[PDB]
Design a protein around this ligand. Sequence first.
Ligand code: NA
Ligand code: ZN
Length: 201
Amino acid sequence: SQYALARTFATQKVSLEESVLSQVTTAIQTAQEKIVYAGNGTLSDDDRASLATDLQGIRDQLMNLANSTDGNGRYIFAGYKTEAAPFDQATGGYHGGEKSVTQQVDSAITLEIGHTGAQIFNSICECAVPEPDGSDSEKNLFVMLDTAIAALKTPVEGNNVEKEKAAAAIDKTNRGLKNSLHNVLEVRWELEWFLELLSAK
Ligand code: NA
Ligand SMILES: [Zn+2]
């Protein structure tokens, strides 16, 4: 019969997620800009290690966003497991809830108002760019970042075998960050739709 409270709760939760995912989007785009500079094979090992540090700062920001809590201190990207931070700080692994938070808002409509951290930070777009060798696309944002950061702190001057190895990891990160950004943008499209549905009452 009356969905007033349900719709206010879903508007609030969806607005919060859009607000945090907007920050995730900006941080992913900043890391992509770093990775473009890292594709320059005339960088010295000191320049490369400076880019690594910049990328660590961005990774740390994304980890703080992935472990975002709401007003009441409950984690927003953990599905129903809202009492513990869903991401492991060191590895970026997800161990929050596997089922998204849903809310019925009309006699017929139920919305996915809380996406899991797996859906946001350990998923890539349907439209993913493939690995050139046919191996699996990396799905975990933090892995993409950490593997780049490690390859940028590995000096490569005068050593072609290492130089190619480090440049292959940077290329792979460039592909992942596309794949991850596109996933977040598709989720944001879905939230934009939910807020249109909700505001039409
Ligand atoms: Na898409
Ligand atoms: Zn969704």
